[PDB]
């Protein structure tokens, strides 16, 4: 555990520095200029490990567009943020890229994600493991009943903390405090997570 600021973990589980965003992640607009989902300077083998065109958000029927928007933000933060270094667990190489633990997600990001997913459906509370991937995309395992989102995630805390097995630990702090990570931002007005990484690098 060395470099914590402006750093990435790639799909081969080596640390790397960020760079200009790649074409696959074009919709991840906040990270266009400085991203861990970056172009490569060498002829590294091309294999997309992104969830953007891989994960089946509609495993229990149509996910409401408002819910999907949060999942896009979530995916973009995980795949592109160069400000998660303080939470990277380097011994764990079992995720598609970095394993992060207890990232202090801003209160608003979590509560509104939970609200906006009220009318969507899912079949499990931990989305990292346990899917049936034989069709190429993930489907619910046999016996895993589709239910309203709040059946499996009864509070915002349960959603944000459990969905990716403690990747997030929702904060009591809110946006603008410099003490929590937000899932999206306007880049022309500045990346607020840079300050947040600095704060926790000094504490962790
Ligand atoms: C660049 O290399 C990385 C690391 O292997 C890989 O994940 C990515 O798919 C490559 N980029 C392209 C252009 O596919
Ligand atoms: C996975 O899905 C396929 C059908 O696409 C099915 O044959 C198989 O039994 C499923 N396995 C589980 C564990 O649900
Ligand atoms: C959250 O809890 C921490 C630790 O107890 C405390 O320092 C801080 O004042 C709290 N922040 C808010 C916004 O409640
Ligand atoms: Ca960021």
From Swiss-Prot:
Q: Which cysteines are joined by disulfide bonds?
A: 8-36, 28-76, 37-80, 60-146, 67-117, 106-180, 110-160, 123-140
Q: Which residue ranges does UniProt annotate as crossing the membrane?
A: none
The protein's name in its UniProt record: Folate receptor alpha
Section of the entire sequence shown: 30 to 233 of 257
Q: What is its main location?
A: membrane
Q: Does the keyword Lipoprotein apply?
A: yes
Q: What's a GO cellular component annotated to this UniProt protein?
A: plasma membrane
Q: Which residues are glycosylated?
A: 40, 132, 172
Q: What species is this protein from?
A: Homo sapiens (Human)
Q: Which gene encodes it?
A: FOLR1
Modification after translation (UniProt)? The secreted form is derived from the membrane-bound form either by cleavage of the GPI anchor, or/and by proteolysis catalyzed by a metalloprotease.
* UniProt-listed GO biological process terms: anterior neural tube closure; axon regeneration; cardiac neural crest cell migration involved in outflow tract morphogenesis; cell adhesion; cellular response to folic acid; folic acid metabolic process; folic acid transport; fusion of sperm to egg plasma membrane involved in single fertilization
- Tissue expression pattern: Primarily expressed in tissues of epithelial origin. Expression is increased in malignant tissues. Expressed in kidney, lung and cerebellum. Detected in placenta and thymus epithelium.
Answer whether the UniProt record assigns the keyword Transport to this protein: yes
């Amino acid at each position: 555990r060395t470099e914590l600021l402006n750093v990435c973990m790639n799909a081969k589980h080596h640390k790397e520095k960020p760079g200009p965003e790649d074409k696959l992640h074009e919709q991840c607009r906040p990270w266009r200029k400085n991203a861990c989902c970056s172009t490569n300077t060498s002829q590294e083998a091309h294999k997309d490990v992104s969830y953007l065109y891989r994960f089946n958000w509609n495993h229990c029927g149509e996910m409401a567009p408002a819910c999907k928007r949060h999942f896009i933000q979530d995916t973009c933060l995980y795949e592109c943020s160069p400000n998660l270094g303080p939470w990277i667990q380097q011994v764990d190489q079992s995720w598609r890229k970095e394993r992060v633990l207890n990232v202090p997600l801003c209160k608003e990001d979590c509560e509104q994600w939970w609200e906006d997913c009220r009318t969507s459906y899912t079949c499990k509370s931990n989305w990292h493991k346990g899917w049936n991937w034989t069709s190429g995309f993930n489907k619910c395992a046999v016996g895993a009943a589709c239910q309203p989102f709040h059946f499996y995630f009864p509070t915002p805390t349960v959603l944000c903390n459990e969905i990716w097995t403690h990747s997030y630990k929702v904060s009591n702090y809110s946006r603008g405090s410099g003490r929590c990570i937000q899932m999206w931002f306007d880049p022309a007005q500045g990346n607020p997570n840079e300050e947040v990484a600095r704060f926790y690098a000094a504490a962790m």
